[PDB]
Amino acid sequence: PDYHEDIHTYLREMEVKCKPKVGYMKKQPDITNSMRAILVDWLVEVGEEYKLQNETLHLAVNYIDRFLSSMSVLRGKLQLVGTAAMLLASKFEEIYPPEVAEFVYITDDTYTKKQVLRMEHLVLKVLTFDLAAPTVNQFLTQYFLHQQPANCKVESLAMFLGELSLIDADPYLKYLPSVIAGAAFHLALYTVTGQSWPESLIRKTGYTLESLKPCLMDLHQTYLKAPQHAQQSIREKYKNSKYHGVSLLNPPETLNL
Amino acid sequence: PLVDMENFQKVEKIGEGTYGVVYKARNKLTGEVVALKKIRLDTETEGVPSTAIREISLLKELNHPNIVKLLDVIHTENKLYLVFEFLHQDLKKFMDASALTGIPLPLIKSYLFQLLQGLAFCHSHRVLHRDLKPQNLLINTEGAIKLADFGLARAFGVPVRTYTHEVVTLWYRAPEILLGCKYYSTAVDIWSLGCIFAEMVTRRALFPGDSEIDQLFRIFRTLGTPDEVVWPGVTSMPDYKPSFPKWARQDFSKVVPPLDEDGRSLLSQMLHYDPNKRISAKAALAHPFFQDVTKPVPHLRL
Numbered sequence: 001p002d003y004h005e006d007i008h009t010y011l012r013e014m015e016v017k018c019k020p021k022v023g024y025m026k027k028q029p030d031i032t033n034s035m036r037a038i039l040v041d042w043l044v045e046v047g048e049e050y051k052l053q054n055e056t057l058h059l060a061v062n063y064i065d066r067f068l069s070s071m072s073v074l075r076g077k078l079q080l081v082g083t084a085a086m087l088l089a090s091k092f093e094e095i096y097p098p099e100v101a102e103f104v105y106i107t108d109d110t111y112t113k114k115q116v117l118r119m120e121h122l123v124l125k126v127l128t129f130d131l132a133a134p135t136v137n138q139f140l141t142q143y144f145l146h147q148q149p150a151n152c153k154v155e156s157l158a159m160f161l162g163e164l165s166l167i168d169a170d171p172y173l174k175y176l177p178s179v180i181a182g183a184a185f186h187l188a189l190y191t192v193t194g195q196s197w198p199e200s201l202i203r204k205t206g207y208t209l210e211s212l213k214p215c216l217m218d219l220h221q222t223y224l225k226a227p228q229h230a231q232q233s234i235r236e237k238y239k240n241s242k243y244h245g246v247s248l249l250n251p252p253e254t255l256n257l
Numbered sequence: 258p259l260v261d262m263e264n265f266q267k268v269e270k271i272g273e274g275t276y277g278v279v280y281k282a283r284n285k286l287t288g289e290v291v292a293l294k295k296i297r298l299d300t301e302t303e304g305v306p307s308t309a310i311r312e313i314s315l316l317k318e319l320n321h322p323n324i325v326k327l328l329d330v331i332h333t334e335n336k337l338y339l340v341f342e343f344l345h346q347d348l349k350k351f352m353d354a355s356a357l358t359g360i361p362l363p364l365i366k367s368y369l370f371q372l373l374q375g376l377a378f379c380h381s382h383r384v385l386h387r388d389l390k391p392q393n394l395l396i397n398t399e400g401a402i403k404l405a406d407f408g409l410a411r412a413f414g415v416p417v418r419t420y421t422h423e424v425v426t427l428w429y430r431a432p433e434i435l436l437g438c439k440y441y442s443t444a445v446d447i448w449s450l451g452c453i454f455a456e457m458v459t460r461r462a463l464f465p466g467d468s469e470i471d472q473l474f475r476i477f478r479t480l481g482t483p484d485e486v487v488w489p490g491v492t493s494m495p496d497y498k499p500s501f502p503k504w505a506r507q508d509f510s511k512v513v514p515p516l517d518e519d520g521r522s523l524l525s526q527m528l529h530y531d532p533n534k535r536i537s538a539k540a541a542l543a544h545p546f547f548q549d550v551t552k553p554v555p556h557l558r559l
């Protein structure tokens with residue numbers, strides 16, 4: 001691509017601005033990481049049901065972390081927030097969103113259509129209509145153009161790891177999307193092809209393998225423990241042949257770092 | 258939100274369509290003249306329309322002299338207003354009012370130059386416009402032209418997929434789209450601009466098709482039917498048929514007779530069949546055609 005570089009530079013600037021407050025969850029009186037984990041897992045499931053793009057999913061989560069970063073929410077409302085987030089993410093990214101009715105259905109009519117629309121309004125107000133946020137997905141895409149031989153298994157496994165990082169606010173709130181993507185990419189490349197974070201991406205991103213290390217370690221750990229994790233929708237999603245069954249792939253025992 | 262709306266004096270309707278309505282309006286407190294777009298938010302009961310979601314979020318990242326500025330958003334319970342900087346006229350009407358005389362070539366150059374600058378800004382911020390047509394290009398008395406109507410615009414940090422119901426009007430539609438390509442790329446906007454460039458120069462639309470197939474054939478008849486050597490992949494593309502007539506490329510000096518060598522060169526590169534090879538907005542800005550560009554003012558018949 002011809003703007004490939006300008007766009008990267010720009011996504012790298014926006015990801016700093018559209019970044020949630022790292023410590024927001026401990027300032028929430030009533031909800032917790034575990035509840036957010038359950039919400040995001042549920043949204044992955046919803047994305048699978050309505051056959052939504054992965055980008056939608058990542059956007060929805062970004063909206064949620066930003067909303068919760070400045071608005072106190074109670075357990076019984078967390079899902080209404082996430083439902084509205086998903087609706088907005090769909091409206092933004094999907095060729096055409098599911099109907100509102102569908103987002104009321106997926107909640108077991110826990111909420112009325114009216115509550116969903118009003119929450120969508122509130123989320124838009126709180127995010128100030130700033131919906132075009134950088135995501136792990138977007139950086140992964142930029143990164144993929146840098147496989148000398150393009151490998152579809154590496155791309156699925158990188159998507160899979162990037163998608164898992166959405167689930168656990170600890171420790172992944174503390175990392176930029178570009179960094180999580182860098183670590184997910186190298187880790188997937190390493191597991192599948194045995195190759196490492198390529199020099200061409202070092203020059204492009206300014207990230208060294210050294211620089212990715214802390215996120216790598218965490219991501220590798222999440223990869224190892226994935227089958228044990230309390231949330232499983234993503235592993236399920238990624239054992240489908242659409243993703244080359246990459247969640248069945250065995251993680252390396254150690255990284256050669 | 259309701260006080261904001263009360264600060265606006267509606268002057269006159271300047272635009273209407275499926276989206277809603279646009280008024281010239283005046284801020285009663287500051288005197289600022291403004292374009293007020295009203296989106297009707299009860300018409301479907303589907304929440305804020307996706308077009309509005311995309312236009313708003315994308316337009317507030319895009320602050321550039323050649324992109325119509327979104328100044329404000331007012332979201333009440335049942336109404337959504339967008340406040341845009343106000344321009345005087347759209348290019349479609351201007352071209353039509355210029356039929357007898359033609360748009361002077363220096364002004365054509367200035368316009369294309371500004372549109373390219375505006376487009377390059379969009380693309381270098383991962384926004385595809387996707388609806389570039391004369392009526393969505395707005396002009397003022399000072400000689401500026403600016404991109405408007407981002408109702409179909411999309412961010413492409415992740416590739417944008419093709420949709421049957423959300424495409425440019427036929428005349429300005431790129432051949433990839435007509436041939437059923439999977440993803441949009443920046444090249445579709447460059448194609449539209451090239452068509453518009455040609456239309457300003459000749460006073461006729463370049464490729465005024467009656468249908469999708471007729472549109473392709475008008476393109477083939479002028480630029481020649483594309484083959485594997487011109488456009489690696491054409492024959493594999495979904496809506497490509499081997500039964501397509503094979504036309505030879507018309508002589509380009511006869512397609513845009515008023516244009517000199519530089520103009521013919523620029524337009525050729527903007528109408529390159531292969532999307533990967535079609536010139537980018539940024540590279541077009543550097544073309545020798547714009548060596549001598551100035552900023553003439555139009556004669557706006559108002």
Ligand SMILES: CNC(=O)c1nn(C)c2c1C(C)(C)Cc1cnc(Nc3ccc(N4CCN(C)CC4)cc3)nc1-2
Pocket residue numbers: 271272274276279292293294325341342343344345346347350395405406408
């Ligand atoms: C989907 N379209 C729009 O949102 C839109 N349409 N128009 C015409 C405008 C918009 C925006 C995005 C809200 C911004 C804007 C900003 N300025 C103008 N100015 C303007 C003034 C007069 C005319 N006319 C020429 C054609 N006519 C005979 C009616 C008057 C056209 C545009 N128009 C507009």
